[PDB]
Write a protein that binds this DNA or RNA. Sequence first.
RNA 1: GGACCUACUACGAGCGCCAUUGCACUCCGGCGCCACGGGGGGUCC
RNA 2: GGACCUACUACGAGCGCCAUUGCACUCCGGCGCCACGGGGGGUCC
Lengths: 98, 87, 97, 96
Amino acid sequence: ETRPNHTIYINNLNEKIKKDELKKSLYAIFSQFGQILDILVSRSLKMRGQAFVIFKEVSSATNALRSMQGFPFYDKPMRIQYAKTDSDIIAKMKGTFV
Amino acid sequence: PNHTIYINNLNEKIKKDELKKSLYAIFSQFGQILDILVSRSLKMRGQAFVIFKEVSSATNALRSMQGFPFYDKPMRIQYAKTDSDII
Amino acid sequence: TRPNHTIYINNLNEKIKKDELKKSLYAIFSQFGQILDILVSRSLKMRGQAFVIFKEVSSATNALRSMQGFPFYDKPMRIQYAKTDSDIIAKMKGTFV
Amino acid sequence: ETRPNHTIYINNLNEKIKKDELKKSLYAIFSQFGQILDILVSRSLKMRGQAFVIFKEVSSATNALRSMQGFPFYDKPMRIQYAKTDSDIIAKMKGT
RNA sequence: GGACCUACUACGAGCGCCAUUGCACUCCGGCGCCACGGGGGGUCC
RNA sequence: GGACCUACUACGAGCGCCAUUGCACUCCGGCGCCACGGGGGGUCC
């Protein structure tokens, strides 16, 4: 599987939720674990419903993976992983996450 | 017990719109919510009301999200003194 | 190789009694789902091992992601997926109780 | 609590767990951050679902708060703080 | 001190239910169920 | 209808400081900073 990283990869998110309400509600949940740099969210409505929360230090992401795993967020328990290396940066320039 | 839970110790620095939408993001798992009243008034601020359809939902919600760090601040959930507008 | 409901843990602190261990493992892996059994090796040659059997594969996969290399009794444990029936074969043989 | 201390104050602990199984599971988790002096646990009504982990050096406690904050321990995420005031065993080192 | 019985007893354990989110280091919340321990009473070595 | 302004206005918004832990279901604590939008008054094509 994937080594630790300061950014966590979230999937199984409710696609029906607008990007603005989502990115801001994700910050509402993960602001406890540390300083969030950016939060990238899947662009299209059809998209599986994914997001990236980029922390300043890996400690926050490591805690986030353990504590918020499977948390029912918008009636859907979100499935947290560690982000593959630089996938957060690659996903932004490719412009699939905003 | 009561059908609506009283939440306080909320981060006042967050706008009313972001708050109601983030609260619904958290408590939608426990049942059907009718309304969520939020106000930045001087007495009513830092607090919120979550109106559930059935009391069983509120008991699990109060049980589950007590002390939940919501915007770096663990929230204080209670039961409402009186009932809600709904009968 | 492929996913399984059971995770294979090794590099466990051998100085800890098996009784305290099984209970402390349940304290850590009960979060990822419903656990069926927790098998710990009693053997002399194969020392420092365990099996955590979850009801659903989702549980085992999440445990692998979250607790990989976690220092458990000041010793970071090394998690894998169980090799198929390897869990029951070690139980139908008494190397794990 | 903002002020660091040798002792971390843990709450939101699974109250149904026996005192012996608890301290042994807490030691199983916090022995990584340094040397633990004692782990005080009480199942009484006032101290129920709480714990104290007293470290030798504050660096141990700070690393512990940093790493295990919000960690789901017995299907319950624990909320770690710093202790209000030095533990009694600590205050016998620093003469208080 | 042991082993086997009991129209006895819930003091501990151990089960559940309710309440408690509480900063300690001078035990100690509340019920209910259950004699596994103990405690009585009894047949023996 | 456009553009280039204002010795005007903080009506919306958006920033910080202070005070605030408060039980409601019509409703707005207090200064400061800022004309992004607006609103006036203008000079032109």
